[PDB]
Amino acid sequence: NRLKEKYNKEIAPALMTKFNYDSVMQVPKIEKIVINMGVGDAVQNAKAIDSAVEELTFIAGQKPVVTRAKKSIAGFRLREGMPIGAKVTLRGERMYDFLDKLISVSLPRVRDFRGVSKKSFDGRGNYTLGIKEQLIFPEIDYDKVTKVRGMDIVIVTTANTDEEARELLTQVGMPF
């Protein structure tokens, strides 16, 4: 919200001038911020996913969906039909409300921090985070936490190449 208004006011004009897009609305934009959860279950502990779901709901703004595994694999003893992982999508005002928490408090609150992954990009503007702890905002009832597994986080943009997204994330406020 705050960020978004700022996105309308300062970010889009600045980088539109910096790249010379003839059409203004061609400017890159964050499309979605999506969360994935994965629990080594195959089932290892049936309560693991049944805990991760309603901790991730607090972490995000709304309930996730339990991911239905695609195909069976005996390497992990993962039979097809035993649920693993959970997903929640975020967009609209919610994605900016989420990025707000992240950039302002979460990354600086990591057990240790330096500049985020230098070349985590995929190649076409998408970009991913691997954060190991659930310490995202400090008011989680953090004493509840038994397992320490953090989040897999993907930010998806309308960028067509890595350079523009790299530049955009700067004034969005991500360190590198």
Next chain:
Amino acid sequence: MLLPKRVKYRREHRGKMRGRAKGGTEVHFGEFGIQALEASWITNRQIEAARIAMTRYMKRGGKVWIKIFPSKPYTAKPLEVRMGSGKGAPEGWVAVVKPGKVLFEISGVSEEVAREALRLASHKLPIKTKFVKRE
């Protein structure tokens, strides 16, 4: 001794031979080649013997090309048995060679020695042959 490392079936019809070869009728990789002017079968032992008769004589002169593969197996019932009651086991691989097919080709070697060496090897094959060279 060219084994096909695998095959879809280990038994199939003997088939028939009619007309010229479908492809590979002229030299394509070597300076000179050898051609067969009637239809017949050709087996691992034949190609192996001819190959050795070629290369061991030619020594360091160059390289020899083989355009043949005995993908076809052929069966034979066990010795001393009444015929019938199931196709016999397979014990050899064979390559169909219609007339016009060029079998072997030589590269990087003088003309006369290739001529006489191909003549030498031809006696290993059971088939009337004709010397042939690239256009």
Next chain:
Amino acid sequence: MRVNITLACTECGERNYISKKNKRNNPDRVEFKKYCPRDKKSTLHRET
């Protein structure tokens, strides 16, 4: 295993339909709604 069964009804005793079923999957006495001929309408058919 699949075992034969004949269907029955409470609206009227006369019932005729047959079917197959798995004991493991349906241990309970199953119900279907079907057209009884002699009652000349649709009714709820149990099994015997």
Next chain:
Amino acid sequence: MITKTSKNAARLKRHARVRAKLSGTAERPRLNVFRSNKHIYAQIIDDVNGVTLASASTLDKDLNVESTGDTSAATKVGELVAKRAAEKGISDVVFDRGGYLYHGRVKALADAAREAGLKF
């Protein structure tokens, strides 16, 4: 950018799916709908000869409203196309949603046609 398929492109597949089952013959023509962002179109089509019979639209040259695309416009255009069928009266048609979902302005149009008396 993220490969977003055209909305009309997605709609065309559904429209072809539904069209596969039915079409409007002589004395049993087919109604059709376009649910454009800014306008609503209606058409009475005879498949076999490949020509329309009568049509109606929000941007028709009379009876306009500031809606021109909302449910009120759908009702008005529906009764309009009902009259446009009436003068060369057909009295029956096979409905065919334009690969849409029968809940909204399409329902308003269908209700208008029915109450006007085009027996589906």
Next chain:
Amino acid sequence: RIAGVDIPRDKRVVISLTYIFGIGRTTAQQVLKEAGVSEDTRVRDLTEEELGKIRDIIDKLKVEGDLRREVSLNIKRLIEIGSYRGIRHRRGLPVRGQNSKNNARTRK
């Protein structure tokens, strides 16, 4: 909490703060003495200003996120300098200098 890590919430302050990798008993007692925190209090009941003004002091000393990496690059220096001390570190045998014949079991 105190510096990127937790602390037990129901222990005396002097002992409890020692849990962060980088300060032991003596360092903790001297720094809490400099702070004036009474040297004995369950960390549950303490005030916000005193918390904050004990944060900055320990931040201006090196703590786990930096000492861990620094000790590692120090042993790295010993490793690739080619020292005898370095190769003992590499192989995992005692480095301070001990008779490896009999005990030597604290390592390996």
Next chain:
Amino acid sequence: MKAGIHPNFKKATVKCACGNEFETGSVKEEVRVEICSECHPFYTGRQKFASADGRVDRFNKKY
């Protein structure tokens, strides 16, 4: 949204120990972040002022 399943989400003010204020919405209502983006060492542009960092390889016997 399907009413009820999601937790109550609402405006949630943010207060850091430095006093920095931020206009957030959250499942919660008030959060006490100890250190914020305006304070954390790497986050201070480049260690502007939240720092204690010196590094040398030295060799000095002159006393």
Next chain:
RNA sequence: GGUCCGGUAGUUCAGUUGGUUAGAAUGCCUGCCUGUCACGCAGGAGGUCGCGGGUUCGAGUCCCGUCCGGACCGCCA
């Protein structure tokens, strides 16, 4: 030449059926015991399943072929 069996720790046999776990004696190793050895008492490691191919989420244990041996038959003039 045909039909049927099997092939597992270094040796001998279970499992080999339970498709989703490799086990029991002996041997071997360390220690104790004895003056020494042997018994004996504590502990411990092992094979990853004759070979190759295939089905299956998963093969030791299912189906094929190859090697190995073992059982039976190979008769009428």
Next chain:
RNA sequence: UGGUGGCGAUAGCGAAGAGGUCACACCCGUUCCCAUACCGAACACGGAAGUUAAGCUCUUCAGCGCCGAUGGUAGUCGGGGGUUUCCCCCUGUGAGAGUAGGACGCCGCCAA
């Protein structure tokens, strides 16, 4: 220019370039209809801030894909020979991977 049909992709895929007052489409926000096995991108909902960027519509091209007889042959119906697992002659018949080239659209009906 939109809508909606028939035609074998000679209509496709690519590479470039033009358009938008109107039409279309992106867009704006979920207030109530409806919905996201999580969500207003998607479903629907009610507007019209700005944009031809994309879609869509037009101009160009043989790079790919596609279509394509002419004479050849291989095969082959029916006759006739031969030293006959296979070859050859005569009346026809006629392969396809190859080029001659066609093509980067043609026909409609309702609304401009």
Next chain:
RNA sequence: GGGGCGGUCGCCUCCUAAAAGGUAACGGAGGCGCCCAAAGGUUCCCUCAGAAUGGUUGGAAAUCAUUCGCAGAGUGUAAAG
């Protein structure tokens, strides 16, 4: 392709099969003696397998995000359509 012994005896898929159908052999390859209260009926909506790249616990593969991708994937099971 004498008997005995061995093997087989019904049904389903393909090739042998000679561009309709049919067509044998102790000819060449497989399967069936079920299963499914939904794996049926209907309305409505989409779209695959594999690969590359980023992502931790987590690799060759678990679960994510982008792109390519006429069908390689699926279709209860054995082959063909």
Next chain:
RNA sequence: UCUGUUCUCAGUUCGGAUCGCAGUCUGCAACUCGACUGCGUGAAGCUGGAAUCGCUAGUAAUCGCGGAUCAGCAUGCCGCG
């Protein structure tokens, strides 16, 4: 040892091993190869299988204190309470 304050049963304020940093002493000399000290660190260990040892009261069990060896080097030995 006695007195008093805290700790409240944990691999813990037990245990202190091993480690990097910074020093002191002696000796020409402390890398192989001393001891001691300030930091940081904090390991295994939560009463030890089969077996086995010393001890008849100032003994065993604990607690320290000296001394030969000699610049420094003692958990050993000798002796004392």
